[PDB]
Design a protein around this ligand. Structure first.
Ligand SMILES: *[C@@H]1O[C@H](CO)[C@@H](O)[C@H](O)[C@H]1NC(C)=O
Ligand SMILES: *[C@@H]1O[C@H](CO)[C@@H](O)[C@H](O)[C@H]1NC(C)=O
Ligand SMILES: *[C@@H]1O[C@H](CO)[C@@H](O)[C@H](O)[C@H]1NC(C)=O
Ligand SMILES: [Cl-]
Ligand SMILES: [Cl-]
Ligand code: NA
Lengths: 108, 110, 107
C-alpha cells in the first residue's frame, strides 16, 4: 500500500490501541481496589468467626461446596483462609506482537 | 472496497485491535467472576452469622426504602443492607458486535 | 490517502471504537454492582462490630496495616473502607473526533 495510506490507517490503529490500553489500566485499578476491600472483609470476617461463641460450632464447607455453590451459578462457611483474591494483572503480550507485526510490514 | 493490498493492510491492523479487545474482555470477565464468587461467599457466611449471633439477631433487614437511604449514604443505619437478594448474578459481556464486523466486511468485499 | 481508502479504514476504525465503548460500559456496570455489594457488606459488618460484645476488645488496625499488607489481629475494614464510584474516562474519544476532523479538513 502507499505510504500515506499506511500512515493514516496506522494513526487510526494507534488511536484505538491507546484507548484499549487506557481502559485496561483503569479497569485493573478499580479491580485492585475491589480486591483489597474484599480481602479486608475476609480478614475481619475470619477473626469474627474465630472469636464468636454462638457460631464456634459451624464448620467450614468441604470440597463438595463447589457444587453446593452451583445452585446460584448453574450450613458451613464458604469463606476460609484460602478465599483471598490474587492480584489481577491484564496481559500486554499482544501490544509487542503488534509492534513486531507492523515492523515487518514496514520492512517488507 | 479500496485496493485489495491497501484493504488487506487496514484489515490486519483492524484484526489486531479486535483481538486485543477480545483478550481484555475475557480477562476482565474472568477476574470479575472471581470477585463475584468471593463476594457471594461473604454474603452467605455473613447471613449465617446474622442468623445465629444473639447480640445482632434483633436487627431487622432493611426494606425497599433502603435504596434511597443507600443513595444518601453514598454522599454521607439501623437495619441490614445485605439480604437473601444481595447475591451477584454472573456477568457476561456481549459479543454481538464482533460478528457485526464480519457482516460489515462481507458487504464491503463485493 | 484517497477518500475511498480513508472511508474504508475509517469504517473499520469506527467498529473497533464502538466495541471498546461497549466493553467499557458493560465493565463499568458490573464493577459498580460489585461496589454496591461490597459497600453493603462493609456497612453491615460495621454494625455487627458495633453490636457484638465478645469481640469489642479487638481494635481497628492503625496505619501500619498497609505494611501488614506487604507480608497482629485488628480490623482492616473501617469507616473509610468504602469503594468510590468507578468511572472510566472518555478523554481520548473527542481527540479522535478532532484527529479525523483535521484529516478531513485537508481532505
Ligand atoms: C493465587 O496465586 C498463587 C500463585 O500466583 C497460586 O498458587 C494460587 O493457586 C492462586 N489462588 C487462586 C485462588 O487463584
Ligand atoms: C439475576 O438475573 C435474573 C434473570 O436475569 C433476575 O430474575 C434476578 O432478579 C437477578 N438477580 C439479581 C440479584 O440481580
Ligand atoms: C473517593 O474519591 C474522593 C474524591 O474523588 C476522595 O475524597 C475520597 O477520599 C475517595 N474515597 C476513598 C479514597 O476511600
Ligand atoms: Cl482499529
Ligand atoms: Cl461479616
Ligand atoms: Na484501521
Amino acid at each position: 500500500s502507499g505510504d500515506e495510506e499506511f500512515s493514516d490507517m496506522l494513526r487510526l490503529f494507534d488511536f484505538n490501541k491507546q484507548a484499549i490500553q487506557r481502559l485496561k489500566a483503569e479497569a485493573q485499578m478499580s479491580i485492585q481496589l475491589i480486591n483489597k476491600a474484599v480481602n479486608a472483609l475476609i480478614n475481619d470476617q475470619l477473626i469474627m468467626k474465630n472469636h464468636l461463641r454462638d457460631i464456634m460450632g459451624i464448620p467450614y464447607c468441604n470440597y463438595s461446596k463447589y457444587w453446593y455453590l452451583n445452585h446460584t451459578t448453574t450450613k458451613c462457611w464458604l469463606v476460609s483462609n484460602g478465599s483471598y483474591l490474587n492480584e489481577t494483572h491484564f496481559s500486554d503480550d499482544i501490544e509487542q506482537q503488534a509492534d513486531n507485526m507492523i515492523t515487518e510490514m514496514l520492512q517488507k
